[PDB]
Amino acid sequence: GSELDQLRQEAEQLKNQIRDARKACADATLSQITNNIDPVGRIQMRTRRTLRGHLAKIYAMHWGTDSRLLVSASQDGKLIIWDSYTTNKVHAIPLRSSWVMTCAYAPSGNYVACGGLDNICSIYNLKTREGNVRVSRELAGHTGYLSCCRFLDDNQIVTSSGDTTCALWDIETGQQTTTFTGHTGDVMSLSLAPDTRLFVSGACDASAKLWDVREGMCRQTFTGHESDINAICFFPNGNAFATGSDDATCRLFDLRADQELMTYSHDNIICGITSVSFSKSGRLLLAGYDDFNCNVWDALKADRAGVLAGHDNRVSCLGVTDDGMAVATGSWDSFLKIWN
Amino acid sequence: CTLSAEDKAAVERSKMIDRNLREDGEKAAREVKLLLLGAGESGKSTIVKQMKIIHTGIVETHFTFKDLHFKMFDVGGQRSERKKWIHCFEGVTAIIFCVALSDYDLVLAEDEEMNRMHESMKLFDSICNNKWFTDTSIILFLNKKDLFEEKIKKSPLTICYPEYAGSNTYEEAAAYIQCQFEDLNKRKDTKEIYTHFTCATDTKNVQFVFDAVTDVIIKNNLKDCGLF
């Protein structure tokens, strides 16, 4: 029985050396350095369009590469594809099981996928010969429910399942290629880097890990939260990422040095965080709280600089466009709004 | 007006798409949806098999009775955390709950000190006192009765329950169990519990489910127009 004890003290002294090297490397906080910059005055953004037509809660939304088309999913069982400029609809793809919680859009605008509670990721084809929408493939190799899936390419997809694992699939063959494991809780958040070489996932127990698609093993881990991780997004540079949580606290980390840089917390908020997305130049950190309104948290100054309260229920999804022209937020009242 | 020749054709597509969406959104709004829950050995399989059927992960069962469409979501294959995927079941008419009467002297696996009725009551407390299910009624089922009678005949009831003053009679033991299960209900003004004992006749079970659903519908309609 001594082997488990010696391995446990070995891991403990390894963690001690890691935290010592982490503490010795940091000299001062980022807020102290950025004390000679003029902050933004006030971000006054008014609604422009109101995309209506859903009949249930909304759980996902993704922007196309053309910054014109967006796709949204609801518990009603539809995958409507909206047009942002003209507000007309383009498709009404139905679903087999009316329990969906994620969506994605192909970088070329060809495929659209959506998982759900039935632990099956189905991929639809939009450029078929006929006028309908067919199911190209149905991937089923996970035990727990699927939480979020993004298209790494036109032929590869990465999914985040609920059974403490993440796997990379292949569309042509239909079987998973590589599986990433190591998490202790339900993985429910991930986002791809701009160069599509690395990606990070947010565990369910105050943990965020970094994965590589080629080699396929955990490289670095970050901690510091209390409750859990609920949203992940990279910096536009691709060299940092800011994560949400449930205890009204979103933080920003660094990839080169596993250190904590800034914490965006306020004494007037005690509500969770659902979605986090950056801006075009990495200056505005939009965050959607579950207290019926959003926030325009500044990225470098850690002070609120705007409130988008035009909603009825809790917001569950929001994302900035590719060119930084507008932001779209979707709440549980089946109403999408375009802010500019 | 300002629209071009073919731009007006795209606007007509939005109209028919919205029409097809509204036509289907109304057909699925006139059917009763009810959730199923229970322990691993709570006899949920025999309940879902005994009732009429017309139809891993979630399983949906569709059946009709007295010109009503019922949907039964059996969330039993989800091994993940329950607090993450429980908010999507906010809109539901009833919550079927099934427990086993004879399952009170059988200890749970890989454990010799904790009884299964304990975690049954814990699950019932977590389901009834949840912050989402504060308005939906709960239908309760007792699966086994003859095996329960045999067990209380050969084995006393005091092994599971620490305090008991009555005799070893099924007529009073069932009433005691029902009164204990109805006690774990904090929200006593916004929800009600309908209890029933599963028998060999499927017609009685289907009739009880239909009666409970009709009562919930009547209460909802009365509370809709602010009449009571």
């Epitope: 088309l69 010969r129 | 071009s4 054709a9 795209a10 007509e12 028919m16």
Partner: single-chain antibody
Framework: VQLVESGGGLVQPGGSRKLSCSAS????????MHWVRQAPEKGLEWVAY????????YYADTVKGRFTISRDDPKNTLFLQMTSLRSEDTAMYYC??????????????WGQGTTLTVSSSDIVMTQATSSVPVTPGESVSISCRSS???????????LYWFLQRPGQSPQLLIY???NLASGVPDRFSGSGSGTAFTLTISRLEAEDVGVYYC?????????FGAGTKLEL
């Protein structure tokens, strides 16, 4: 997909026969239908259109009030009836599917066509020339001119372009100003400014010869060109 025409026979003046076409292999219930009349040794001209769901029915100014047309969705069959018939209605008849949304390709699949023989403001679009002699392996430039500015306020010209093989039905080549259609090689390219449009071909082979046409879609009364022939 498959399309075929039926109801082709010699009809005396003053008599009427209905035209029927059957479509199978796609969702006919969500495709608009266009009819196209092709006179012998002449350019083809638009005839009629029906939208998805029979919501908007349009006609041409020449045959207005004289042709009755309808759709049958359950059987995927299209019908065309006329009341009066004259000596100039002797021409080929084609049907072409078209669906209009963001990023769509109208007039994608042309029908086979039938033969009909009879025995007895708007946009002006004129092509450059009637025929050009071209030796193989040389670039060709074809110019189609219009009398109006096709460029709309949205920012996209509405001048389509397609080729007709000798003895077969024409096929779409290039929608809008530049986008290439599906299935056609990338040799064909087009450009424009708003008034004068041109098309350039990189390499020319023997399997792509015939006549060319340029269509307009800015204002609804569609008009085609005269038709420039390519000689091998």
């Amino acid at each position: 997909v498959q399309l075929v025409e039926s109801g082709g026979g010699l009809v005396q003046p003053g008599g009427s026969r209905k035209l029927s076409c059957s479509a199978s292999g796609f969702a006919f219930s969500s495709f608009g239908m266009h009819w196209v009349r092709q006179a012998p040794e002449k350019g083809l001209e638009w005839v009629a259109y029906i939208s998805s769901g029979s919501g908007t029915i349009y006609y041409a100014d020449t045959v207005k009030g004289r042709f009755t047309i309808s759709r049958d969705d359950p059987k995927n069959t299209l019908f065309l009836q006329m009341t009066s018939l004259r000596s100039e209605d002797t021409a080929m008849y084609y049907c072409v599917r078209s669906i209009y949304y963001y990023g769509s390709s109208p007039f994608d699949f042309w029908g086979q066509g039938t033969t009909l023989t009879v025995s007895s403001s708007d946009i002006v679009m004129t092509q450059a020339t009637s025929s050009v002699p071209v030796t193989p392996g040389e670039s060709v430039s074809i110019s189609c001119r219009s009398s109006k500015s096709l460029l709309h306020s949205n920012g996209n010209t509405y001048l389509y372009w397609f080729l007709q093989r000798p003895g077969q039905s024409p096929q779409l080549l290039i929608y809008r100003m530049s986008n290439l259609a599906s299935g056609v090689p990338d040799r064909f390219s087009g450009s424009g400014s708003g008034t004068a449009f041109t098309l350039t071909i990189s390499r020319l082979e023997a399997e792509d010869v015939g006549v060319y046409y340029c269509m307009q879609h800015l204002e609804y009364p569609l008009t085609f060109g005269a038709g420039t022939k390519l000689e091998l």
